[PDB]
Amino acid sequence: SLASRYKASTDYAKDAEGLTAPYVSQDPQETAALVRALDDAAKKGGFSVKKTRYAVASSPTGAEVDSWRFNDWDYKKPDLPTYARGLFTTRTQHGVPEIAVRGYDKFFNIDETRDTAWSAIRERTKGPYELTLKENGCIIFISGLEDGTLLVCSKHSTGDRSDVALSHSSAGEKHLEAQLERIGKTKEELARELRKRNATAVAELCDDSFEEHILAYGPDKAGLYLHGINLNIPEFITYPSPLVQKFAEDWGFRKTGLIIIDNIDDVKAFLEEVAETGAHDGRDVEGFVIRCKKSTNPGVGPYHDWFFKYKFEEPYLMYRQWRECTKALISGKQPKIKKHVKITEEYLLYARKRLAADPKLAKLYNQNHGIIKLRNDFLEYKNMKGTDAANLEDDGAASVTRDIILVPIATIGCGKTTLGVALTKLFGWGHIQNDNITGSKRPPRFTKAVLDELNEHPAVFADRNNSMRQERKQLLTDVKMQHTTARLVALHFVHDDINTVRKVTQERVIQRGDNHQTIQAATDVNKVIGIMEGFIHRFEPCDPEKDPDEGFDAVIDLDPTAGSRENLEVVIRELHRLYPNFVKEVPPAEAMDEAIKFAMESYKPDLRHI
Ligand SMILES: Nc1ncnc2c1ncn2[C@@H]1O[C@H](COP(=O)(O)CP(=O)(O)OP(=O)(O)O)[C@@H](O)[C@H]1O
Numbered sequence: 001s002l003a004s005r006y007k008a009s010t011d012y013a014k015d016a017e018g019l020t021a022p023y024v025s026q027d028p029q030e031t032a033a034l035v036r037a038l039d040d041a042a043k044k045g046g047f048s049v050k051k052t053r054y055a056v057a058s059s060p061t062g063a064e065v066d067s068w069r070f071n072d073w074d075y076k077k078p079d080l081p082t083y084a085r086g087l088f089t090t091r092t093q094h095g096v097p098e099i100a101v102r103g104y105d106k107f108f109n110i111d112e113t114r115d116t117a118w119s120a121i122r123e124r125t126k127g128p129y130e131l132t133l134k135e136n137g138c139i140i141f142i143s144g145l146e147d148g149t150l151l152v153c154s155k156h157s158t159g160d161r162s163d164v165a166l167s168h169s170s171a172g173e174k175h176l177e178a179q180l181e182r183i184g185k186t187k188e189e190l191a192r193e194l195r196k197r198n199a200t201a202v203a204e205l206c207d208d209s210f211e212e213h214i215l216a217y218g219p220d221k222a223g224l225y226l227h228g229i230n231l232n233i234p235e236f237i238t239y240p241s242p243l244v245q246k247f248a249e250d251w252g253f254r255k256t257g258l259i260i261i262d263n264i265d266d267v268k269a270f271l272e273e274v275a276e277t278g279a280h281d282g283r284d285v286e287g288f289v290i291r292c293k294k295s296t297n298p299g300v301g302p303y304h305d306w307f308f309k310y311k312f313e314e315p316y317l318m319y320r321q322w323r324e325c326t327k328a329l330i331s332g333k334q335p336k337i338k339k340h341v342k343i344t345e346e347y348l349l350y351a352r353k354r355l356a357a358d359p360k361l362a363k364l365y366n367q368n369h370g371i372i373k374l375r376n377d378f379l380e381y382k383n384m385k386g387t388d389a390a391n392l393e394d395d396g397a398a399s400v401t402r403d404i405i406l407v408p409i410a411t412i413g414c415g416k417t418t419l420g421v422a423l424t425k426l427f428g429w430g431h432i433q434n435d436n437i438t439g440s441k442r443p444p445r446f447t448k449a450v451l452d453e454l455n456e457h458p459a460v461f462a463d464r465n466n467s468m469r470q471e472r473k474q475l476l477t478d479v480k481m482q483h484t485t486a487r488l489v490a491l492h493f494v495h496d497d498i499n500t501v502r503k504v505t506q507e508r509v510i511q512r513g514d515n516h517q518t519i520q521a522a523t524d525v526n527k528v529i530g531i532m533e534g535f536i537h538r539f540e541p542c543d544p545e546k547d548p549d550e551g552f553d554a555v556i557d558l559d560p561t562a563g564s565r566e567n568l569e570v571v572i573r574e575l576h577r578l579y580p581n582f583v584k585e586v587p588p589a590e591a592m593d594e595a596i597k598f599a600m601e602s603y604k605p606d607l608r609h610i
Pocket residue numbers: 132133134135136137138139155204227228256289309
């Protein structure tokens with residue numbers, strides 16, 4: 001198997017002997033232009049940025065740094081003057097603006113963006129691919145200032161705050177001090193070295209005694225895990241990981257394990273195999289960060305450093321649930337059990353017994369400490385690994401290939417019919433339109449027609465609003481009565497942002513029409529709007545923690561304020577994630593584009609209100 005052949009290594013520093021690290025000096029003109037674009041964006045009433053000034057307490061000259069932070073969604077515009085996440089600027093003693101800290105570019109999980117679809121990665125990246133272990137603590141940035149100060153920052157901050165004994169950046173600096181003393185070097189030596197390289201060192205602080213995350217980093221493992229070195233310039237240029245490991249050795253950092261894989265299809269197979277257990281090389285692994293080169297035009301053009309991530313769902317999602325349930329337990333709140341119901345109830349009974357036997361544990365858990373150990377104690381009590389515990393609840397979804405019914409929960413104009421047509425174009429799935437059924441006994445006849453479509457199709461789009469809970473109850477009950485293996489998947493159009501929903505849907509129906517039967521008989525815009533407001537008023541959100549929506553096999557949240565092209569890719573990506581043998585891969589962006597274009601050209605209802 002691929003996971004057995006490929007082992008993560010922290011022994012690549014020898015492979016870096018002789019190699020030259022990337023280096024670009026800061027251009028005063030370009031840096032000033034960046035700072036002016038940021039400053040201007042910070043003063044404005046799309047592209048927005050927050051500017052926060054911090055004194056550098058260890059600076060002998062009193063240096064200050066400006067930390068810049070975009071709105072998180074801005075990273076998907078093409079507008080930004082830099083895509084750094086983590087960005088601090090400063091001024092030299094002689095008044096030159098400089099980049100003091102340059103984090104990685106913001107990067108995304110598989111299927112989170114167009115660029116991190118496997119279909120796009122396969123076309124537009126080149127290897128060899130660096131698979132770096134994603135250690136989970138907090139990020140620490142380290143660089144050298146002109147006055148010789150070693151600057152240490154967390155993702156967006158630096159220095160001490162009086163509202164905590166030890167900030168994240170100060171904890172990182174204290175770890176740095178100990179690691180440098182361990183090798184006979186000094187903070188000013190490291191500062192001079194990083195400034196000579198015009199670079200930011202990027203490490204993960206992992207230390208249970210400071211703050212617990214998901215996996216334990218006890219005293220034997222606690223420290224700064226160096227995983228990157230970036231150039232302090234507006235574009236993104238990062239060190240090859242063998243040189244990162246060599247730098248870790250020279251300056252006393254812990255190393256981030258690395259695997260190099262040449263072929264993107266082996267990368268994909270390796271990751272999906274590790275995802276079966278969340279473990280590799282006999283340790284738990286929360287994920288990988290994959291580093292390669294990417295071009296904007298597939299196959300040609302210039303290539304730039306580019307990352308994507310692959311985070312493993314289990315057992316870490318169950319572990320996060322257990323942590324939250326534990327906090328609910330000691331505070332007297334209701335534990336919220338979403339998934340893994342049987343083993344989580346056992347975990348809570350176990351935790352209650354431990355708490356009754358040792359009251360002082362609650363004061364540890366109050367401070368978010370000891371909770372990893374409680375989970376490991378419980379797994380020991382069960383003689384189970386977490387991955388086994390997370391597989392106790394299993395609805396057989398991994399094996400599903402057919403008999404899926406997609407059930408919109410929506411109001412008029414959310415794009416249901418458009419989505420159904422697009423899915424038929426892409427996958428050949430069935431589509432039953434309640435709008436085409438007239439007369440009495442409509443809900444049982446609709447339901448039976450939906451069922452019977454499974455004779456010729458692996459899935460069927462059950463096209464009805466289902467705005468009221470009683471309609472989901474009816475459909476759930478009648479399907480389960482007549483078809484013992486059908487899985488019902490709700491496509492819940494979330495109506496939280498109700499006045500934006502109203503505008504978007506009403507624009508669609510008024511301007512481009514809708515075949516809902518009441519719309520097709522509406523003879524003016526006021527009748528249309530009143531009909532639409534009727535469904536809004538009657539609408540009951542999907543709530544999979546209560547009856548009847550609890551009966552759905554899965555719920556996929558969609559956004560009626562978003563275009564149908566975006567809701568289409570959410571549907572497919574989520575179906576793939578939930579039922580990987582049903583939707584085996586997400587089609588390329590171009591195919592979903594063509595599906596939606598076909599949907600709105602072939603499906604054009606008449607407007608009887610004009
Ligand atoms: N080998 C590695 N390469 C890159 N980043 C790594 C890494 N090992 C750990 N990381 C961490 O992984 C982070 C990005 O992955 P995510 O955990 O998904 C960001 P997030 O948790 O969604 O928001 P947050 O960073 O503000 O908490 C980086 O910011 C860095 O702290």
